[PDB]
Design a protein around this ligand. Structure first.
Ligand SMILES: Cc1[nH]c(=O)c(C#N)cc1-c1ccncc1
Ligand SMILES: Cc1[nH]c(=O)c(C#N)cc1-c1ccncc1
Lengths: 120, 123, 120, 123
């Protein structure tokens, strides 16, 4: 029960988890370029688990990109955004469990992080 | 009015159409001497999603006020059956003298957010 | 694993669950008055479970009130809101699992409902 | 300017202090012919949390634009170490002719929301 990184996606129009949403994760590279890190599709409960492991999850800059436009086109709704992106630094600073959650509407989105830890 | 020095203004936006939320009914109450809510002001949002002229500086004394927005009538007229009955904002006002209050609401059928911007009147 | 109603509370300032937040639930009465239904305090994970049961959870109007002001005063932050309230109708219409989530900041809050169901 | 017919306006608010987010750096890019982001316009929010005058109707052609807000420099100057590096909004503009775009952001240290209000210019 150790997932250093988890993504959750919700739909504000229908009051349900946003199922089958593509998610891509990149790590900032030395040349200051984005390199593919992990990717997947949200499950029936709007979640994506097992993107990585504590050993591979070192300090650095990460970018989480959510394909919100494909989600909305499948419902027959025209969206405003091309995609939703979250960029943050992961620091061993202290606590290492990260939950990124995204709430989606056709013209707006909100994102929040919940950073927590078992013990230390 | 002036430019924007109203003691109380409400602004409602639509997260589904990316537009101002027009013709939304808004009701404001003040808590009375007896723990009961009394009618204070009423109105509807204009074509830019705003509601101006609800009160005056002199009438807007210190107190606990309730801003109730009728979101359910708004989604229903669009053919959508939403989650909430209404949106309500409860807050203590003019506590440490007069201030100008902007209450904003962003609406979606199963979600809403609300924010306040408080400014100190011509200092 | 059957909780018709669950409440989740998060803190936007500190990126953590909002722990020990008082929550009260009322049911609209015939005289159109609010009657105490259930109450509790959020756990270490920001959640409140077991407010009720499927038999007691009949159709009607419910009001969930979150004591946000006490939460913020304990951190030494002066808040704008007296409390956060969610009013909704529970209809057997179809699906009966309700998750109310609230995200808190000193001057703003957002609430969303996730309505779902196992089978039917 | 006029009253409010700017093709692109940005508005940043602070959810912790209930105020406009003043002196926030904003950078806008357009995707070029070669899948690369090119600099388009730059600026800072004023005392009301707004940014006016970034472009003109004639210069704002159809394309994919990126609005990047520097939220991290804003929280840091307040003594707070926030979660995000910045906030970014990516969207296709003027696709089916000219429109006026208002991008709003509401900020908190570990959260942000963004909304767009799109209007059809003097019809
Ligand atoms: C971006 C934004 N997000 C919210 O969650 C919210 C709420 N409530 C309001 C606004 C906002 C939009 C336009 N002008 C001012 C504030
Ligand atoms: C991202 C998010 N945004 C909101 O505006 C909100 C409200 N209210 C809740 C959540 C949320 C975060 C984590 N788990 C579930 C929901």
């Amino acid at each position: 029960s150790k997932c250093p990184l988890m993504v959750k996606v919700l739909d504000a129009v229908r009051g349900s988890p946003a199922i089958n949403v593509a998610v891509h994760v990149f790590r900032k590279a030395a040349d200051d370029t984005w390199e593919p890190f992990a990717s997947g599709k949200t499950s029936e409960s709007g979640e994506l688990h097992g993107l990585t492991t504590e050993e591979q999850f070192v300090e650095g800059i990460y970018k989480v990109e959510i394909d919100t436009k494909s989600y909305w086109k499948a419902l027959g709704i025209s969206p405003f955004h091309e995609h939703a992106e979250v960029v943050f630094t992961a620091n061993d600073s202290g606590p290492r469990r990260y939950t990124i959650a995204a709430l989606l509407s056709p013209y707006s989105y909100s994102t929040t992080a919940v950073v927590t830890n078992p013990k230390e």
